[PDB]
């Protein structure tokens, strides 16, 4: 069956700029069946373009669709703040994997915070250590957990907020989960952070029972 490959995965642009989204088919398809959808977080997808070039009802004229054969393009002439969302192309029973149109802003290095597990939690038998990476741009961030002098793996879960509607940054929370017994046999708890905004990586740590 037909594969629609979308490029790039993420497009970082500023409001007012022109956006060019690509949708490439694994084989030559009819332009009469190529559709584009827009989707914002927490919302249903909405049809933008159908038959490669036709806007749906009420879609503003800044949106345009083109291409034929294997190459299809979605153009947004001058990005408005409401245009920052995910875009999918579709043909027959297939969808492209989506392109996120993201706000490009001034590079912002993260402010880093580490939180020890509360005494209330420790009574239960589990220790959750939390690392906060606050108000950074771009989204690409690496968090490395270190217990004494050993880099952790498979015992942390991570979650990222949506691009801030006020400052255009992201925040990321990582949680390192240990048993009371594992937590209690170690001293130094560190969260090492790497990001484009930083000249060298940043570490925030605490000594257990201090």
């Amino acid at each position: 069956e037909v594969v629609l490959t979308q490029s790039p995965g993420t497009l970082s642009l500023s409001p007012g700029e022109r956006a060019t989204l690509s949708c490439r088919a694994s084989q030559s398809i009819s332009s009469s069946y190529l559709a584009w959808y827009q989707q914002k977080p927490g919302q249903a997808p909405r049809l933008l373009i159908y038959g490669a070039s036709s806007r749906a009802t009420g879609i503003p004229d800044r949106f345009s669709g083109s291409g034929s054969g294997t190459d299809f393009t979605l153009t947004i002439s001058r990005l408005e703040p409401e245009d920052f969302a995910v875009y999918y192309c579709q043909q027959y029973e297939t969808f492209g994997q989506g392109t996120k149109v993201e706000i490009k802003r001034t590079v912002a290095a993260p402010s880093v915070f580490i939180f020890p597990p509360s005494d209330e939690q420790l009574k239960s038998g589990t220790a959750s250590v939390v690392c906060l990476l606050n108000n950074f741009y771009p989204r690409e961030a690496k968090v490395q957990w270190k217990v004494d002098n050993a880099l952790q793996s498979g015992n942390s879960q991570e979650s990222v907020t949506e691009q801030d509607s006020k400052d255009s940054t992201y925040s990321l929370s990582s949680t390192l989960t240990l048993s009371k017994a594992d937590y209690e046999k170690h001293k130094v708890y560190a969260c090492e952070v790497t990001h484009q905004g930083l000249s060298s990586p940043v570490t925030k740590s605490f000594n257990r029972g201090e």
Binding site: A44, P45, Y50, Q90, Q121
Partner: protein
């Protein structure tokens, strides 16, 4: 005036059967197809299948053939999507959409959230995340089911610098979430900071004062 109204949120156990619905209005229901689209958490869109309610013609995409049953009752302008035996991997948002004969989805339903899990309703445990120039404090909202939880700071009076993170599903099958706030370091003596956690499925409303130490 065209609208597609889907049935309510579903919390189910693996192995249970399920039938979800999509009612059309404001147009001729028997003149258009109805598509079903799956969107797994943090994932893209998947075309499951289509039905022409006018004559009950149904087509499933290869990955959905024999996995799900699509049907319609034209006397009540309703189309259905059903599973004979749910799996945890069926946890997703499911959209129905109207499809004219040219193959695009011109009108979408609001979506139905289907959560499939072994777990039972459990209220969260709320733990303090205790504290240059900026101090960060928060609340860890751990081990609850099902989603969602809402978090506010100081009964809604504190909104700036607040980040309530997307919940994460632990290996236990329980959700965990954090809510943090950025405050000037100078305010840690003059100000009280309370996170108000609410998990409606278990009727839990917890207020936790977050103190440095």
């Amino acid at each position: 005036e065209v609208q597609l109204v889907q049935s309510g949120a579903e919390v189910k156990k693996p192995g249970e059967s399920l039938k979800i619905s999509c009612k059309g209005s404001g147009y001729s229901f028997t003149s258009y197809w109805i598509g079903w689209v799956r969107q797994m958490p943090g994932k893209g869109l998947e075309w499951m299948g289509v039905i022409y309610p006018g004559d009950s013609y149904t087509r499933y995409s290869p990955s959905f053939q024999g996995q799900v049953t699509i049907s319609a009752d034209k006397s009540i302008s309703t189309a259905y999507l059903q599973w004979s035996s749910l799996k945890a991997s069926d946890t997703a948002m499911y959209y129905c959409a109207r499809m004219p004969n040219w193959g695009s989805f011109d009108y979408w339903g609001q979506g139905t959230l289907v959560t499939v899990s072994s777990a039972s309703t459990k209220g969260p445990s709320v733990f303090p995340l205790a504290p240059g120039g900026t101090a960060a404090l928060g609340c860890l909202v751990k081990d609850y089911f099902p989603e969602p939880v809402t978090v506010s700071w100081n009964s809604g009076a504190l909104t700036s610098g607040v980040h309530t993170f997307p919940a994460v599903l632990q290996s236990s099958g329980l959700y965990s979430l954090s809510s943090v706030v950025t405050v000037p370091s100078s305010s840690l003596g003059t100000q009280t900071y309370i996170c108000n956690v609410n998990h409606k499925p278990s009727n839990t409303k917890v207020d936790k004062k977050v103190e440095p130490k």
